[PDB]
Each structure stands twice: as C-alpha cells, then as structure tokens.
Design a protein around this ligand. Sequence first.
Ligand SMILES: Nc1ncnc2c1ncn2[C@@H]1O[C@H](COP(=O)(O)OP(=O)(O)O)[C@@H](O)[C@H]1O
Lengths: 43, 62, 50, 371
Amino acid sequence: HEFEALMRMLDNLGYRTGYPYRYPLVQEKTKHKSEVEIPATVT
Amino acid sequence: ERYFDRVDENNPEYLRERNMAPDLRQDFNMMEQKKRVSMILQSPAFCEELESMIQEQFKKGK
Amino acid sequence: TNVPNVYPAAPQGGMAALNMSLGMVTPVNDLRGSDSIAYDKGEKLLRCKL
Amino acid sequence: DIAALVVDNGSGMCKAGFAGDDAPRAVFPSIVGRPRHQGVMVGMGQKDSYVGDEAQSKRGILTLKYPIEHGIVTNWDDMEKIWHHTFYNELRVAPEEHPVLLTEAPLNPKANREKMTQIMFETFNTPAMYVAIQAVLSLYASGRTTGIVMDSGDGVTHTVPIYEGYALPHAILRLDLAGRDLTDYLMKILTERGYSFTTTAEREIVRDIKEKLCYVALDFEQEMATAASSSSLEKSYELPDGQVITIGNERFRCPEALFQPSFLGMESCGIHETTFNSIMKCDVDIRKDLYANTVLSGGTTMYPGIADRMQKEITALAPSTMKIKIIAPPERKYSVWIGGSILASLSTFQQMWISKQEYDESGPSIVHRKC
Ligand SMILES: Nc1ncnc2c1ncn2[C@@H]1O[C@H](COP(=O)(O)OP(=O)(O)O)[C@@H](O)[C@H]1O
C-alpha cells in the first residue's frame, strides 16, 4: 500500500514505468443529489 | 341548477376558464405541479451561490 | 509530445522540488467548474483549506 | 407588498406574470389584426384594431401581422399596443407602481435596447426596469450555472455557452432558422399534396398542424424508405370547416430543415453543427463541462425525438472519449420566464434595478452602463 502511492507519484510526472497496479485508480467527477438537478433523457 | 349557481360574467378570473386551449390547460397544471420557482428559492446551497455570484459580478463590472 | 516539466533538485531537497512540480501540474482546487454547485460554500471552503 | 413583473416577449408569444410565482398569469400570441372586409352593421361592436387572444378568434375577418420578426421589431406602435394590452387588459395592474423585468436576444443592434428603455420609462412611468438575456435565464431555470444552452424560438435560434455564470460573447452563435420559416416550408411542401394555403389565417392553421402532427426522424433515409413502402406513417387532420386532410409523408420532412438547411437553401450549417462550433470556440479546460451540461429551450425543440437525434449528431462530431448527454426539461417552453421569476426574487437584485431618477441624468443609454 505504501509502494503503490509512491509508484503512482512516479508515473504522474512522466516516468514511463511498467509496474502493474494491483488496485486500479479512477478519477471521476463527483455526483449530485440536489433536487434541482434533472436527469438526462437518455443514457 | 348548476347554471343558476354560477355566472360566466360575474367573475372575469372565472371567465378565463372558458377560453383556454387544451395544451395551455396542461401547461399551467404541470408547471405548478412542479413548483420549480419554489424549489430554487427554498434550496439554500444553490441559492447563496447565485446571490454572491450576481453581487460580485456587479462588483467589478457592468 | 512533452511531459510536464520537473524543476531541478537539490541533493538534499529533491522531494520538495517533486512536491512543487506536482502542485504546479495538478491544482489543489479542482472543484471549480461544474462541481461548484455540488458542494455548498461552507463545506467547499473547508475542503479547500484542508 | 409591491412585487416585480416579468414580461417575456418573443415573435409570436408574449407571457407575463408576477415575480415569485410558479406560473405566468397571461400567455397570448403577439399578433395584431386589422379588419379587411366591408363592415356594415350599425350599432354593434367594431374596433379599429384587435390585439392578442381576441384577435386570434376572429381570423376570418382580420389580416394578422406580427410586430416582431427574427427578434427585431418592425413597428414600434404595435409593440406599444401589445405592452398596453398586457399591462391593462391581462394583469389589471398599474405599470407605474411595480417594477417590470424584460428579456431580449443576446446579439441585437444598438437602437433596440435604447428605444425599449425610452418607451418603458416615458410611456408607462416604470420606477425600475431591467433587461436580461433569455438563454441565461433559461439556464438559471435549469438550476445549473454552467453549460451550453440552445434556445430556439419562433424568431431566431441561438446557442450560448455560460461558464460560472458568465456568457462568453465571442462563443455565442446565432442562426436565423426558426419555427415560422418551418411553417412556411411546411406550407410549401403541403402545396404538392393538393391542399393550398395562402392567407395568414391559413398560416396559423398550418402552424397548428405542425404543432400537432410533426416528429423528428432518427434516420432520414430509412424513414423515407419506410414511408414510401408503407402507409403506416399517415395521420388525418380535421380542418375547422370539416374537411379532412392526410398529412402522410411530410410529418418528418418539415422539422428536418432544422438539421439540413439545404432544403431551404440556407448557406449556414445545421443546428447541431452550430452547437458544436460554439463549443469549439471555447477554451479546452471547460469543454468537458460544455459536453456534460446541455439543455434545450424554446417551443421549437418540442418536436418528439429531438433529444435522441441531437445527442446522436453531437456524438458523431464529438471525440470518442467525450461523454455526451442532453437535458430536456418538460417545461422547456416557459423556462426563460421561470428564470426571470427566479432573478427578480433575490435579495441582492433590488440594487440591480435601474433607478428612475438616475435615468434623468443618464438618458436612454443608461442600460448599457448597468447591463
Ligand atoms: N407543442 C409543440 N410542438 C411542436 N412545436 C411547437 C409546440 N408549441 C409551439 N411550437 C413551435 O414553437 C414556436 C413558438 O416558440 P416560442 O417558445 O413562443 O418562441 P419565443 O417565446 O422565443 O417567441 C411556434 O411557432 C411553434 O411552431
């Protein structure tokens, strides 16, 4: 768990490492639950 | 006697009932079923954002 | 074609330059935009401070 | 308790209501009718000119003309008549007691705002009046402060992107392709079926036909093949004189001029291409949000299947990694007024009103100072 964060630090700048992450990471935009927001018509 | 009970010419804002298009008849009912204007004002988190955004956009310009 | 730039490092101050390069690459406040509505002002302020 | 008034004007529709209300009080077409036949009946009701909902009842004996075309007023006297009818006959409120809120198109000539402000202070003695952008108010009615909005009315179509409450003036795109031109095209393509409509009342009849029996095809060529090879895509309209017509093939032909203006022969591109170009004109960093928030506004976007076709056409031009979604509120006809009903209700908006006394030393250009 300590090595994964360090190695992702190394990958962020441009060090093209080939280390496979056991735990994949995704950034996604946060979700809303205000009553103002209207859902989309389609998928 | 319903016809004696009420008169079309007694109340103009009841006279509006006779002269409505059907889609105009739905639009009012659906839109006051939704109560969007009430929703936006009653909900604070969007509200003070709109408040301060208008106020400090007036602050520097326009 | 070019990776984000890395500031040169002192022999004992490499990771400070690492942090400052990473901070210039990734802003600490990225909630600005469409996510401004998601959080109220008071909670967003604490998130930014922390 | 003095409350502000919100009056939304567009070519063919005028709405008005008190601020803070869910519903506008008055909705009526922006029409002016003058009698055309020889009036010989002594002692009964005749008038020089009919305006509003009453004029639409007597289409047979009236010539109907619109004061606004393409978002630009042509005769200001008719506009005064409509405003007077709105203030007095519809709401029965004094115009000089309550402030009034007004809306207009984003891109417009100089003289329109100045003339509108001059008329609104001088004729009605309005203590305070403000001008706002229609599409910005529609986005406020959707309740998100960011995203690109498409408002297509009966006068003109325009897409503006708004980021953090600011509409970028360079990225605003305007296309002169509206519902009245679609009505004219529908009349021209109904000519070939054997039914002929020439007068203005018949134009209103054709507009009602378009509102009732039109839809947007997902695939144009496949729908032509289906309509040519079968009689399933046929509906019957019943005219006010009792005659019955069959709309048939034309139902998906009239709205398709929105996407391909080559049918009308217009040089400009389609509406989806216009939205895509308006997104291209913005900065890269915000483009994600512009592809994430898109709302439809205006009565022209009430054709069935408009959202699916819009999403498909935008996704075709968009990058593959981008996510495309289209938001279509059910009350997209009256969104702009709703936004106005939001904007007048705020506690910071009372200082945003134009002062009556300040106009005396400023003049008609004061709105360009304050708005
Ligand atoms: N239910 C409907 N279905 C399809 N089209 C409609 C419908 N109602 C109105 N329209 C079209 O929208 C136009 C009115 O647009 P509108 O929202 O009044 O524009 P504006 O208010 O900006 O003048 C009409 O000309 C008509 O062709």
